[PDB]
Amino acid sequence: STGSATTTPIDSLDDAYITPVQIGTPAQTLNLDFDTGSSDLWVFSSETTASEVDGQTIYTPSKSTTAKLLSGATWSISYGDGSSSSGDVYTDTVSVGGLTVTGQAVESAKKVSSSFTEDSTIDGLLGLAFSTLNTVSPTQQKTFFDNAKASLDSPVFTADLGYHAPGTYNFGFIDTTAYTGSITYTAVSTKQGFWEWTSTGYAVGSGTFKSTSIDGIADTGTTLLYLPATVVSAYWAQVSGAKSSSSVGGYVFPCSATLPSFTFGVGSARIVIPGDYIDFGPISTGSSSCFGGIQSSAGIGINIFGDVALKAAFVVFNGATTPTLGFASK
Numbered sequence: 402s403t404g405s406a407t408t409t410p411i412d413s414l415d416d417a418y419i420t421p422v423q424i425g426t427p428a429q430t431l432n433l434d435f436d437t438g439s440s441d442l443w444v445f446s447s448e449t450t451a452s453e454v455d456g457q458t459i460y461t462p463s464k465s466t467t468a469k470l471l472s473g474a475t476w477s478i479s480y481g482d483g484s485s486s487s488g489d490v491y492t493d494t495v496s497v498g499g500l501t502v503t504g505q506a507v508e509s510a511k512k513v514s515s516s517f518t519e520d521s522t523i524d525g526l527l528g529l530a531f532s533t534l535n536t537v538s539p540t541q542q543k544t545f546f547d548n549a550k551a552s553l554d555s556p557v558f559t560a561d562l563g564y565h566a567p568g569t570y571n572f573g574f575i576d577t578t579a580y581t582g583s584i585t586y587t588a589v590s591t592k593q594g595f596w597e598w599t600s601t602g603y604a605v606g607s608g609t610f611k612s613t614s615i616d617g618i619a620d621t622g623t624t625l626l627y628l629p630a631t632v633v634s635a636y637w638a639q640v641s642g643a644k645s646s647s648s649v650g651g652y653v654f655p656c657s658a659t660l661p662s663f664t665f666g667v668g669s670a671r672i673v674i675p676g677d678y679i680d681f682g683p684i685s686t687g688s689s690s691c692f693g694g695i696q697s698s699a700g701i702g703i704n705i706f707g708d709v710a711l712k713a714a715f716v717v718f719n720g721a722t723t724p725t726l727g728f729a730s731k
């Protein structure tokens with residue numbers, strides 16, 4: 402079997418992407434944030450503290466004839482940005498673009514942090530990292546991908562994120578019409594539960610390519626590109642007037658500047674991020690200082706190839722017994 406679903410940016414800056422997902426019987430359609438950096442499928446629900454819901458569509462298990470409460474199971478998650486949520490667990494039927502999984506663990510939020518309440522466009526998250534990171538206790542639960550793997554034509558899913566435009570998540574097949582040239586595959590380490598890989602270097606604009614190993618994770622759930630301080634300093638040094646701002650919390654640049662592209666290495670291949678992808682607009686309404694899409698990972702502890710990098714490529718998440726990541730230009 403296969404599945405295919407359109408994913409859409411939630412705002413004019415591509416801060417995140419939402420994908421419709423059908424849950425329950427009859428279907429309840431929620432718009433979820435597909436997150437290859439986490440492994441929990443959790444949703445706003447009828448059980449969520451009422452004051453913590455502000456426009457989101459909620460899952461109501463009491464209206465699904467296939468929902469079953471998973472007795473005694475709870476979940477609690479904290480994300481690298483300080484957001485958090487928690488609740489109890491149902492099993493139900495979950496479908497993504499024609500691809501159906503029965504008995505998927507659907508984690509019902511009882512409490513959500515403020516950053517989720519204020520995001521009216523995101524009804525929950527669909528985790529696509531490895532199931533070892535799932536937070537359900539006392540019995541760990543599998544991700545949607547792990548549950549679907551056996552019935553997929555190929556144990557893969559692909560991310561084709563758009564720049565200020567819709568894109569596609571495909572499950573079980575690789576669309577050879579969606580990219581140019583060849584796909585370059587690279588090894589993945591699952592030891593931390595992430596889609597962790599090693600980039601072979603970088604270049605700034607038309608500058609010379611620097612061969613150097615950058616270990617990081619492919620994370621559709623993170624907006625920006627977080628790289629080591631040496632790399633990030635080399636990039637912003639090429640933008641007149643750019644500086645690191647402690648009060649803002651990252652590199653900013655004059656909104657009148659033109660940004661250079663950023664190239665990152667995948668084996669012997671190169672993925673080029675256009676400079677426009679790195680502009681995230683004024684730091685406040687009406688400001689002439691703009692926020693940069695490439696930031697330092699120093700305070701994080703790990704390098705993150707987020708949406709800024711991934712949307713410049715066609716990305717294959719190969720969940721075979723030896724997992725790999727594939728990158729192609731598009």
Ligand SMILES: NCc1ccc(C(F)(F)F)cc1
Nearest residue numbers: 438439480481620622623703
């Ligand atoms: N998108 C999920 C996510 C968020 C943060 C991190 C961090 F901070 F631990 F790297 C990993 C995964």
Ligand SMILES: NCc1ccc(C(F)(F)F)cc1
Nearest residue numbers: 436480484516517520622623
């Ligand atoms: N990396 C997972 C994640 C995704 C979205 C959010 C937001 F946007 F709701 F804050 C937080 C954390």
